[PDB]
Design a protein around this nucleic acid. Structure first.
Lengths: 266, 345, 10, 231, 205, 45, 217
RNA sequence: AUUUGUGGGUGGUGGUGCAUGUGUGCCCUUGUUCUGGCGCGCGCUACAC
């Protein structure tokens, strides 16, 4: 019902404000059942429909979204819907750099441990957020830690002291987005994603090292992918390659209870 | 020259039975040890110098020999384990020798087998997967260069194994041991290129938390609420003694009967120590070179701290935490500067 | 474009 | 601490013409350049020390005065120096016969003297040389004197052997914030430094040992780059 | 860019200032001095320019951690400048001093959307659902009115106009509401209008 | 605070590139074969 | 004094032009191979047209030998051609200022294997034996100027060098190709400027930084 | 009743140097074919937000 509500249930009502309390309760619902965690994601779309149609209010909206951002989001199948929502939510004009930095950094921490579908979903989102707020570029590039040839030995000493005295300021447990020091922290996870086993995800991570020439990547073609889709895409690809054979010789596939797989027996 | 070519590929530069049914028809008359001799006789009969067109038939023999290896591994081998190991080792050596000449049709058969494996998994989840699939991944790891960035056979298998690690619900010890085998295979895939698998991190956190969580209480610790696990009933009792020696090696044939039998605590500890050994290997190889090592290792640090607090005897968390603390103290953690560009003329 | 390439011939 | 610029995308610095009177820069004037075209019989050729001794003797001019290779190699040094690629360098050529040539920093002088000689012949007869990709005039012949085309706040020196030796980095540092530098280098075999006495503020020396014109241009350019942190 | 045109001639551009590389969200003229233009941009630096020589900023005011998008001039004192930013601090700068650091700051907990000065002593800052009126000599808030559902976007103040009520403060928020408050009557609520959508800006003649 | 408003630098209309900085009439005029009066009539329609 | 290959003690600056294009062809007339003089002959030989460029080596020799460090005597120059012919250049010789006279002197040197002075006490240009490690002094640091190497300041690098330790710099007089011409010889690879540099400008930069470091003014 | 498959070797109808044909080094590689080959100069006109 929550999934179909904004599309099929709402445009047939006379007064859609009747469902506002139901949607608010479902959005605020936090139960002991593990399956109950996904109903804010489904409730948010129909809730925002009423909020946009009739000028109505949900208190602490962005703090609630920062609460919703959690490691389960990368694994839930409904994340494409939530990212479609977060695009127009974080495309707001009256947003602070601390707030958008908090969202970027939490999404980075989520991409640390996530499927490549989620990584492909998040990477252009971070690019677009940095593109809309260029004060968040200090999270990728801090000029204070660059050593240039044209600097004094005293400046070299100050840079060395600053390097050995740096600590991470980001506070993961902080609920309020603005009070996290994510704008002071940096994005090491996006650099770690450059060394990713999927060749396409690796290059998509490399776009953060490249200059920011392009505007937004049109999230719709990145939102759709899954594990089955990646296999079909690689099986039907334009380039054809000669397979390569390993020249090293292994005696046995399995270790006996030289061997290719230690710790595994026949 | 071969090492240089491998490093460039790492950087990014790019009668004879025609059916496995007929192979099984001959194999039924043959004995278990007579299968390598029969295969060698078939190769000697259909060598290309003998007659025209023997190359295509011998390539079909490559395909059906791989299929027969998978079928023999799928079939039960508890009675003749030593003879089965000898026959399979000889068959795999023969397979490498022929794959040196006929890698193309073999690679096509492997890609088709990957597609069939994914179709069966989408049909029936964990029940479709088998020891034949595991040994297929292991054989692929030898036959093809895993360090290469975009390999026609390694990358579909790699994303399939990552899908298996991230997707299947580890509710039984059979599934946990299957995942541990997949982690070991993925590590031996990435032994050279040393790329980063987030699914391996996810699997390690999930498995450590499942074995931490008390079975009788069936309630996770409060700080581990972010990690979502599958079965709370799987757990490790306090009364077990880790001072007793256990074998870290897990056999493939034990996995089938291990689900049927009631789970024994010693074998659970063996699977746990196997996973911990794989985790130690990944920490030493990949994560310490990654720039986000401190951000990766924090849930692992908390889970191993819980292990140390609960069980004072089991030395592996103290060893891993000493290694991790030394690495985190040694490595430098400074803000990134990725947008530094050479000026344009 | 040119980096010590020299001027192209006719 | 301080906000980053909105775009960190690297951009090509603006190229400096004589239309830009304001921007601080380094200017090199290769004075007394031997660039004269003469007609043989019928072939117009740039006069050469090696290939035209008979013509030079017949016209009475000394063969040692016909050295366009010095101007060629000085142009190569200046245009290949990193300050030119950074866009902070401008080059003028002041021939011995009184012709003034402006060199667009984007031009690529041919590395071989034969092609350089052909290019100079066409430049001296057609008064301008354009580019193949776009029709922008890469070489131009402009009206004398140089001080009409020079920047408004500019400090003028002559590189001379007899003048006291200075340090280029310290000189460029002692320059003002808005003021440009113009350096007159004699692109000639053996003369004395009266070529720019009507223009220059002062005469400076680069080293105790005698220097070639290309070495003098290279030394002053390297000092300018270390003073302005170009590298 | 900050472009200064003649007020009734869009063809002629008297001045064009390259104030920042980041967007400049505030351009205001000094009320006491006709030669000073204050611009606030996303550099988190506000700049006072002289109209005559606009090649360099006459003064740069810093010390804001996020997104100054409003500023104001205190009526009696021409040396004081108030800047309101999204970190929640209204910073008062004395221009005769160094000006890199504010002389004092006033903590409006929500991100400050707008700042206005209703007297030589009292200023009103809106951000969040409420607006707070502060005294400058006491550095303490006198009143705070949270009459709104959504964030208060704009403020205007008008006094001595022909009306029963001598001073009036107009507050417009995102819930479509524009409301009138009486500064003499403890900033109580007198009248209101509801519009069809979120009201970014409001003004009274 | 959520404010959502209801742009492309280059537009490809009728296989012709136009700039979003110019007006609609200017873009239709820069499209070859269309005059200013025709562009005004098209915009009015 | 005059620095020679025999001396192994004095702190000096060795500049080795590498992959220099110095080719003699018989047409008899012995001619140096340059592309503009011989467009068709190089095409008939099948080697690359852009490869044959002796003018780069000529310009580098002019800049190096007219540099003040050569006037003070701290500099020594070797030319390793693409064939493998290795040339020792005396600090006292004046290279002909024009390319045709330079081509003539290269033809004479490459055919006679030595050039004798008028006084004939020593040899102005000499052909010496492979390798260069025998002729360079004992305590020496070998660097290659490469674009992808990190950018250094020449003055700071030379002052970081020791008091009794010479510097050897391999500069590619080759027009196009990789920087692997001397990788197995050199201690490391350094970068001079952010922009790509011609070999003449690289030699001039490293020489002038050396003069500023060693106070050769 | 040859010709295909599967393979796979491979240098000189070489040149040059030394000792004197001879013997060993060095270096480069690793052919038949017809036919063609005007100046000066006065106005005037374009090209500048």
């Amino acid at each position: 019902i929550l999934l179909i509500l904004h599309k099929r249930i709402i445009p047939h009502f006379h007064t859609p404000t009747k469902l506002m309390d139901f949607l608010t309760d479902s959005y605020n619902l936090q139960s002991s059942n593990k399956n109950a965690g996904v109903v804010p994601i489904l409730a948010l779309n129909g809730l925002f429909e009423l909020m946009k149609r009739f000028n109505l209010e949900y208190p602490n909206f962005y703090m609630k979204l920062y609460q919703i951002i959690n490691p389960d989001l990368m694994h839930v199948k409904y994340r494409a819907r939530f990212f479609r929502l977060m695009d127009v939510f974080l495309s707001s004009t009256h947003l602070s750099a601390h707030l958008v930095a908090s969202f970027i950094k939490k999404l980075a921490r989520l991409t640390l441990e996530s499927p490549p579908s989620a990584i492909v979903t998040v990477i252009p989102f971070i690019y677009n957020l940095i593109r809309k707020h260029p004060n968040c570029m200090i999270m990728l590039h801090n000029p204070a830690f660059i050593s240039n040839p044209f600097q004094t030995p005293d400046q070299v000493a100050n840079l060395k002291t600053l390097k050995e005295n740096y600590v991470d300021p980001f506070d993961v447990h902080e609920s309020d987005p603005e009070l996290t020091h994510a704008l002071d922290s940096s994005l090491w996870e996006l650099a770690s994603l450059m060394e990713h086993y999927h060749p396409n995800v690796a290059t998509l991570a490399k776009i953060f090292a490249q200059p920011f020439k392009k505007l937004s990547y049109n999230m719709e073609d990145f939102l759709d992918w899954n594990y089955d889709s990646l296999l079909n895409a690689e099986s039907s690809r334009k380039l054809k390659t000669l397979p390569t054979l390993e020249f090293e010789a292994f005696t046995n596939v399995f270790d006996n209870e030289n061997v290719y797989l230690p710790g595994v027996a026949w | 020259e071969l090492e240089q070519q491998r490093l460039d590929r790492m950087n990014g530069m790019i009668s004879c039975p025609r059916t496995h049914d007929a192979l099984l028809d001959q194999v039924k008359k043959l004995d278990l040890d007579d299968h390598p001799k029969i295969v060698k006789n078939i190769i000697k009969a259909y060598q290309p110098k003998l007659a025209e067109g023997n190359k295509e038939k011998l390539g079909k023999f490559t395909a059906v020999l791989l299929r027969h290896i998978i079928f023999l591994s799928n079939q039960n081998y508890l009675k003749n384990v030593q003879s089965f190991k000898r026959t399979q080792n000889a068959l795999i050596s023969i397979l490498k020798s022929l794959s040196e000449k006929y890698n193309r049709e073999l690679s096509e058969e492997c890609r088709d087998y990957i597609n069939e494996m994914q179709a069966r998994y989408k049909k029936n989840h964990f029940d479709a997967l088998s020891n034949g699939d595991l040994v297929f991944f292991s054989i692929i790891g030898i036959l093809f260069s895993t360090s290469d960035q975009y390999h026609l056979v390694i990358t579909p298998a790699l994303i399939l194994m990552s899908q298996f690690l991230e997707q299947i619900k580890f509710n039984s010890l059979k599934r946990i041991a299957f995942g541990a085998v997949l982690v070991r295979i993925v590590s031996q895939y990435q032994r050279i290129s040393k790329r980063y698998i987030p699914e391996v991190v996810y699997f390690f956190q999930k498995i450590l938390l499942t074995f931490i969580v008390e079975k009788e209480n069936q309630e996770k610790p409060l700080d581990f609420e972010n990690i979502r696990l599958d079965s709370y009933e799987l757990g490790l009792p306090l009364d077990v003694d880790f001072t007793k020696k256990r074998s870290t090696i897990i056999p493939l044939h034990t996995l089938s009967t291990m689900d049927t039998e009631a789970h024994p605590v010693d074998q659970c500890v063996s699977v746990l120590l196997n996973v911990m050994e794989s985790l130690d290997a990944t920490i030493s190889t990949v994560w310490k070179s990654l720039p986000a090592f401190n951000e990766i290792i924090l849930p692992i640090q908390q889970l191993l701290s819980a292990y140390t607090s609960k069980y004072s005897d089991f030395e592996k968390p103290r060893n891993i935490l000493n290694k991790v603390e030394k690495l985190t103290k040694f490595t430098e953690h400074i803000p990134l500067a990725l947008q530094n560009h050479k000026p344009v003329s | 474009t040119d980096r010590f390439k020299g001027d192209d011939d006719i | 601490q301080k906000a980053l610029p909105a775009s960190l995308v690297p951009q090509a610095p603006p190229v400096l013409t004589s239309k830009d009177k304001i921007t601080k820069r380094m200017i090199v004037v290769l004075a007394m350049a031997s660039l004269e075209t003469h007609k043989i019989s019928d072939k117009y050729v740039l006069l050469n020390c090696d290939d035209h001794q008979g013509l030079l003797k017949k016209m009475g001019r000394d063969i040692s005065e016909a050295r366009p290779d010095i101007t060629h190699q000085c142009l190569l040094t200046l245009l290949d120096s990193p300050i030119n690629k950074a866009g902070k360098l401008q080059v003028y050529i002041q021939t011995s016969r009184g012709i003034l040539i402006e060199v667009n920093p984007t031009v690529r002088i041919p590395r071989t003297f034969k092609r350089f000689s052909g290019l100079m012949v066409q430049l001296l007869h057609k008064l301008s040389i354009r580019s193949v990709n776009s029709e922008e005039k890469l070489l131009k012949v402009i009206k004398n004197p140089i001080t009409d085309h020079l920047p408004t706040k500019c400090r003028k020196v002559t590189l001379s052997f007899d003048a006291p030796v200075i340090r280029v980095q310290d000189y460029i540092e002692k320059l003002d914030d808005d003021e440009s530098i113009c350096v007159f280098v004699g692109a000639m075999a053996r003369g004395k430094d009266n070529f720019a006495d009507e223009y220059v503020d002062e005469k400076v020396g680069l080293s105790n040992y005698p220097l070639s014109a290309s070495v003098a241009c290279s030394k002053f350019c390297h000092g300018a780059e270390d003073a302005w942190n170009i590298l | 860019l900050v472009s200064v045109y003649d007020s009734y001639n869009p063809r002629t551009i008297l001045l064009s200032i390259n104030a920042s590389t980041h967007p400049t969200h505030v351009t205001k003229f000094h009320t006491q001095d006709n030669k000073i233009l204050a611009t606030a941009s996303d550099d988190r630096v506000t700049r006072l320019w002289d109209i005559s020589n606009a090649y360099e900023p006459q003064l740069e005011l810093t010390g804001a951690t996020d997104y100054v998008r409003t500023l104001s001039f205190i009526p009696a004192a021409p040396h004081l400048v108030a800047t309101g930013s999204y970190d929640g601090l209204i910073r008062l700068y004395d221009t005769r001093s160094s000006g890199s650091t504010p002389i004092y700051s006033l903590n409006h907990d929500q991100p400050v959307e707008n700042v206005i000065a209703v007297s030589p002593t009292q200023i009103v800052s809106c951000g969040g659902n409420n607006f707070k009126v502060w005294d400058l000599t006491s550095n303490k808030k006198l009143y705070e009115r949270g009459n709104f559902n959504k964030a208060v976007t704009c403020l205007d103040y008008v006094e001595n106009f022909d009306s029963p009520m001598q001073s009036a403060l107009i507050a417009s928020s995102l819930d479509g509401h524009v409301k009138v408050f009486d500064p003499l009557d403890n900033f109580q609520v007198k009248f209101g209008w509801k519009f069809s959508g979120p009201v970014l800006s409001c003004a009274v003649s | 605070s959520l404010v959502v408003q209801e742009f492309q630098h280059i537009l490809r209309l009728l296989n012709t590139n136009v700039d979003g900085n110019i007006k609609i009439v200017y873009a239709l005029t820069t499209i070859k074969g269309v005059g200013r009066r025709y562009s005004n009539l098209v915009c009015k329609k």
